[PDB]
Amino acid sequence: RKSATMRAVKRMINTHLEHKRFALINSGNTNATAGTVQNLSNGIIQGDDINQRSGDQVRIVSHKLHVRGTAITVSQTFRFIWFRDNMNRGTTPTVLEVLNTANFMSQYNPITLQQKRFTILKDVTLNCSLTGESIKDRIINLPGQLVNYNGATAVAASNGPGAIFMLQIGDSLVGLWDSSYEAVYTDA
Amino acid sequence: RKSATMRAVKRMINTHLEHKRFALINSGNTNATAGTVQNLSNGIIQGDDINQRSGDQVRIVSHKLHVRGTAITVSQTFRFIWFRDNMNRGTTPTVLEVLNTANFMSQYNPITLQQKRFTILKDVTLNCSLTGESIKDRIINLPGQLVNYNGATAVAASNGPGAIFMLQIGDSLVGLWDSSYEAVYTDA
Amino acid sequence: RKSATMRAVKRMINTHLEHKRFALINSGNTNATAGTVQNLSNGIIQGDDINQRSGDQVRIVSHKLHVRGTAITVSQTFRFIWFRDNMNRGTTPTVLEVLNTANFMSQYNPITLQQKRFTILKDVTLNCSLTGESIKDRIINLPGQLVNYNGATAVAASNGPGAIFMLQIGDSLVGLWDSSYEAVYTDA
Amino acid sequence: RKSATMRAVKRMINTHLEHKRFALINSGNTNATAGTVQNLSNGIIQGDDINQRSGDQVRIVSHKLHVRGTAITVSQTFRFIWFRDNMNRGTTPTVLEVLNTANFMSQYNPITLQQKRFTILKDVTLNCSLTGESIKDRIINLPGQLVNYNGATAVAASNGPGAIFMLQIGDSLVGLWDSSYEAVYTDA
Amino acid sequence: RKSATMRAVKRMINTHLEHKRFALINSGNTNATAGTVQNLSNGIIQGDDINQRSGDQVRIVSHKLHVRGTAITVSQTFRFIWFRDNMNRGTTPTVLEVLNTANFMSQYNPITLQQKRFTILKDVTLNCSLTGESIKDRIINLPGQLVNYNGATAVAASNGPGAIFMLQIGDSLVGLWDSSYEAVYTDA
Amino acid sequence: RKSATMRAVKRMINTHLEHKRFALINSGNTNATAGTVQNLSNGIIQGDDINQRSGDQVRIVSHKLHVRGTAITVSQTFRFIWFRDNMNRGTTPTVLEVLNTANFMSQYNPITLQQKRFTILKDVTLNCSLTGESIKDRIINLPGQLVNYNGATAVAASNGPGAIFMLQIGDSLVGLWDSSYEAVYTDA
Amino acid sequence: RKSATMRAVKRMINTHLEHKRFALINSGNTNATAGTVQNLSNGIIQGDDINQRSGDQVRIVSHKLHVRGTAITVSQTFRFIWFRDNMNRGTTPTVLEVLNTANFMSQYNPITLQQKRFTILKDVTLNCSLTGESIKDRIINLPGQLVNYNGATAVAASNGPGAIFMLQIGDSLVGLWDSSYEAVYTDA
Amino acid sequence: RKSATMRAVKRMINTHLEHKRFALINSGNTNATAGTVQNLSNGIIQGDDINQRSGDQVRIVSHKLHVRGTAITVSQTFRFIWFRDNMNRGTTPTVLEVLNTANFMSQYNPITLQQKRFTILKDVTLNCSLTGESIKDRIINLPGQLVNYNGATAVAASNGPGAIFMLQIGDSLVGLWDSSYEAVYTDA
Amino acid sequence: RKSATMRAVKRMINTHLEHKRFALINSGNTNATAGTVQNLSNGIIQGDDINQRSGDQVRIVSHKLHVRGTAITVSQTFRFIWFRDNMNRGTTPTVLEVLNTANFMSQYNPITLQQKRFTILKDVTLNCSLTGESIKDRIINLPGQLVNYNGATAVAASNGPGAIFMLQIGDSLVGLWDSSYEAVYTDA
Amino acid sequence: RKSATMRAVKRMINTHLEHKRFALINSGNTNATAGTVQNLSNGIIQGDDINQRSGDQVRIVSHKLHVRGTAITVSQTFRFIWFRDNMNRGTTPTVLEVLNTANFMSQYNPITLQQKRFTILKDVTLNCSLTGESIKDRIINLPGQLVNYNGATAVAASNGPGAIFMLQIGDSLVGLWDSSYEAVYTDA
Ligand SMILES: [Ca+2]
Ligand SMILES: [Ca+2]
Ligand SMILES: [Ca+2]
Ligand SMILES: [Ca+2]
Ligand SMILES: [Ca+2]
Ligand SMILES: [Ca+2]
Ligand SMILES: [Ca+2]
Ligand SMILES: [Ca+2]
Ligand SMILES: [Ca+2]
Ligand SMILES: [Ca+2]
Ligand SMILES: [Ca+2]
Ligand SMILES: [Ca+2]
């Protein structure tokens, strides 16, 4: 009891809040053996439109990430690591903050996972084969959390605690990857 | 029980939300035998002031419409139909969407009322007589609902589902009508 | 229980307090397209008579307002807005404080109604027709509240929080209106 | 019972609202024998940043005021009166509205405290001695309430009911005082 | 219980008492801007007939008043105030005893209503329009009370406490009014 | 029960009200075979002192009357009738209103006692004998009621319902009487 | 039980009574080795304004006293004794009535404290040092009681039982003291 | 219960305390039209005998007053007012403190009875007639209270709160009165 | 239970006993490095006045001591030790009876505290600084006990068990101290 | 229940863990108007001694900070802000991260407090006066939390989430401050 009225309260609170929505696409990037980190939630900037925000917090209700790779020239691997930076002070995290070494096979950095600097949301490896399935994709939908910002505009210095990112890393420089991303969020 | 704590929760949610307010006036229009449709909620645009909105939703707590006619030259009829367009995709609805024929006596369009494209909020007929009461008016106050928008500014293409409109239609081209309208709404 | 003895206490308190009475009349005013605001409770001044007060508070038990219009030259509209100024700092409020625009059709000012500067007690529209009923009137009786004063005499600077006023506004300069008003009040 | 679930609802409502924050500093002012009134909450203007607001209401969760005086030339007194103007119609209140006379020893104005125009939040007197402690300071943190605004920008005419101010008054023209102030507030 | 047998006793008492009846008509009087007061119950005189009385008391079971006005020359107002004089010492009350000023818009005299010299039974305003409804009427039926007399015959000096009267007052000298009146009363 | 808390409420109400006090003396009047009526409560006039009143009502908590006669020339009778005029419309009542005939032996007027115009509070007859006790006196203390006034000053026209009077009447013109009177009253 | 409804009655009685307010300031007095007694409540005189009274009683709800000393020429002591004179017959009490000897160190007069002629409300000693804190102040707020008056105006002969005073006494003639005082009081 | 053991405690306390006794006689005084006030309890002075006291308090258990008048030359009235001065500061009260005017018929002074400066214990009027009973007397015995003193000896300046007095006043200068008085009192 | 009626008995016993009062002042003494002992209760001598006693016992209900020091020439310390001599046989105790050594820092004498010859009521150290606060004071109020005497007059040989004293000791011969003292006591 | 065995488990866990201890001192620093941030927990480095750590976490059981200022040349203010950096990624935080502006009066940075980058443990302001107390100090002891490290040695890059720091800022460059600090911590 009492815990089940509580989540009827939650439902009621939510019918009262606008569920804003922000969508992004990022097509035709080369695979990277040293890795890159891509912004996801950074693109929600201060303003009055449906895919903007008031102040420096939003709360993601759910968000969805779609990754895709295509082998070019050689069969190859594409890894995508969807993560939340719980402690971001206005940066795009480096590969070496997240992975122990800059290698597509690397396990996580032991120091930064120990202190929970990051939370891994999903870690996806696609092996695209020029003698097999040369194109692969994966869509992942998850509930979200609080996201704090450190500024108004879509620049690194605006990222803050709870920022959402995706790390891409693979074993070739020559294949191509696409991603897209949507967050549904309240902003009250 | 439980249903009465629920609406104490609702009251509590509401003390936490700003009740924004938007007021509009539209004076000195000619009676129309073919009808017109006037925007009511369209005029709430994106911005930060008390009669604006964040994002593409607001929730009307209550709204109030005031209509008035004056017979000129001939005694005549003024009809006013206050309605919600539940499915608006960025237009001002035509007379023929709402009425079966473009005539002040017409019943509702059977197709669009069947599918509940519109909800009639109030349908008011004033008969102004040059040998009698030549001026009549009516004020109607009602609780409101969700209103979605399709854009930022006060243009037809910004109307969306839940948009509030008023259809005026009468039997003379020569009488004059006034209306005004206020919505009280949360915007969280 | 307990709540029903409480209002037997209230009744007992009231048999012990003098119910003072103040009556006012204001005849033969022209209709106003830009509006006027008339004092109602201001006329209760410091003194010892039955229609005066000790100190700077009284409590209105009930009060009654009577409005009347007569069409002259043209059929026309008379609007009367009986309101309490909850925050008066020693003024007669302007039309634009109460109405969004200075027009007899206007809805309320959104800012000042939001913050509850005023409480509308009754809003009455009389349409007097030179081809119909050219004379109309309405009497409204209501329970009252606390009224604070900012001075001793009957001047604007003596109005204070809870002051009672009436706003008149119409669509012609030429018709005539009358009002009268009585407050019954304790003064303990 | 029921009252303890109610304030679990309140807590839940609050985790859903951004707690915006506005900070201000005001250094190096001369002591004033006739007094001044300083704005505190006025500086929260309409906009989308973390220390701005949507619409004309915010709700202060808590706010904190820090006052400091330094005796110059003569030992002297600094009084600071932190107050809420419950009825502000778009002004900075005068000293004489708050104090019976413009004197650092004065009690409150009897008329305006009677009608509850103002609520005193804290009244602090610092005696700084050039033969003793010549520098004194006090920090006071309190829960807050609703604040209404009458406009968009940081000007007197934007103050409205619930505006927060500080009155400074002392017995010398020559000492210096500092203040700073922070409000934490929701804005839903 | 006990309270419901009590009003079966009352019913039984009443089947034992003659319900006497007195009827009166008063046609074709001019409207009066200074007002008049007309006798209603005065006309029940000592004697043995069905519309007379024994002694100086009767008890009105119910009574009924019918008022009517007709506009002549100008559209105009007729006010009729049906009242009981709780303290009559053998007079017809003046207009100024009942109304604060001798004006058809006046509120009640504050002194005499405070001490409950009079009880207003019904206050009726008819606006008769030479461009509209030029003839209006109203009938009002009410339960009655004790009526004391100060003499035997139908003269002012016979009125006493509980005497029933009607005050007529309007805004023209030229319109005509009619009234009639019936009391049903016991006389045991 | 409930009735005993009620009169604890009454006691509490009374500790909150000033018990004002008015004292009067009236010495050396001749006995009157035709009678006189003397004012008692009339002398409480509008003002701010302890033996004055605000408005037109006071409530007598208790009052006390002291009468005294002395036979001169012949042994004789002095009668004193302390009474409340429940219906006073701004007069000093005549002897014949109270007594059936103007004679010290008369019973009460049947008409005015029937309708309860007056309430006799005490009727005292002193027989002073020049061969016996030639001087007699009586003091009577009683709880009081509401007293309404019809004006501000100490004149007949200010008496109103609940006015307190004393009628003196005897069988000689030549004896002398004294009276004095005190009312304790609230005035809230 | 019953005792908790009783103080809900009290609260209800108080919402019905005007809380009048009287404020006073008394600046720049010399320290006194023989002492002075200053009036506090005396200044509430008969009249109709917010800081006046009807009759000869008021009831102080709360009152507040603020004392301040400044050492001049020599470091010195200022004593302030806030007291109620329970038996005042129209005087300002002497120092020797309150203190056993006219010395700033004296204990209370044994005779007058024994019979409870006075009630000490607060006794405050400030030691102001020209080598230290040369300025000191203290504010004290307390609930109040009944205050009787012996006259209408602000003179000694108007003080009566319950009069509020402050005795100042110190060890130098040369330092300066300030006081101010506010009473909140009902007057029903 | 508990309340009945309490007054068994009281009885036990009293068997342990000496009941001291003081007796006084005051013969052959002239009647006074302007009045006198006579001391009763003043005569108990500090010392060790049975009709003396230790310290400045005694508690009267019961006391008894005997008054007597004799008409000389003219039949006349003698009034005796036995009263306690609850607030005496070392005086014999004047006639005008007790009576509104210095007249044997006067009611009490309204100011000093309002504030309860005095409590009347018994008010006795004897009318002695040279043609009737020319000698009259009355004895009155009552329980007593605390009596405070302001000094050691039998002088006015020793009276204090609770002092017992008798006021004599009549209508002739020429008759003679006697009184005597006994107090039984504890002194622990 | 039973223990709470017991202290209702105590209260009842006390309303029956005179609370005598004795006040003393002792100004302008030099600080003492070897210490002095001052008499407090010794000054209550046999006699009949309010600040005297019957016999050789009194019971102190409460007593109050006020100490004050002023630095002269050098900043310095003043210690004051308020104590009861439980076993006094008719002396003023020496410093060395109370303190282990005659030094302002000394702890208590171990022998005499062990056997409970004395009870320390309060031990107060004031450090007065010629560069700081050069004047300090402390007031201490406490309930009291039995005090026995060994004689009638105010001499050392009259002190007895329960005698109250104050020991003063400091570190300079040159500063000045004041004290005063009041005992409230029964004497039955 | 169950919650009280739980904290008996906690106690048992703790008797099994070494409570390591690290102490630090930092003397003779100049006051800073632009502020500095000092490391506290950084100095616990990897190693095997009692004031070192294994791995990159410790858990502070309690820690204690001692701050001290001394005014030089001018009386001045020293502020010390003891805080935890919940999100440190291997830095010493700047003044502007913590304070809104680099001023000793500044409130907190709104962005970084909103996202809870820091938790303020204690904020202490010492006003040292060259005419008063020129030296002040404060010691504060608190329970602690988890501290993560980003490296082995005592350099900025080793700070991590939960790092403890102290910000010093004042209004002069010339005064001197000292601090010292001890953490008690487990390291299992
Ligand atoms: Ca936000
Ligand atoms: Ca929205
Ligand atoms: Ca009032
Ligand atoms: Ca017509
Ligand atoms: Ca807002
Ligand atoms: Ca100093
Ligand atoms: Ca009859
Ligand atoms: Ca009154
Ligand atoms: Ca009063
Ligand atoms: Ca005694
Ligand atoms: Ca004794
Ligand atoms: Ca570790």
Residue numbers in the entry:
A (entry chain A), B (entry chain A), C (entry chain A), D (entry chain A), E (entry chain A), F (entry chain A), ...: 8 to 195
What sentences appear in the manuscript?
The plant satellite virus, satellite tobacco necrosis virus (STNV), is one such model. It is an example of a T = 1 capsid and is one of the smallest known viruses with a diameter of only 17 nm. A great deal is known about the virion structure and it was only the third virus to have its structure determined at atomic resolution. Its CP subunit has a Swiss-roll topology similar to that seen for the first two virus structures determined (tomato bushy stunt virus and southern bean mosaic virus)4,18–20 and now known to be present in the CPs of Picornaviridae. The N-terminal region of the protein is positively charged and forms an arm that is a common feature of many plant viruses, which is believed to interact non-sequence specifically with the viral RNA.
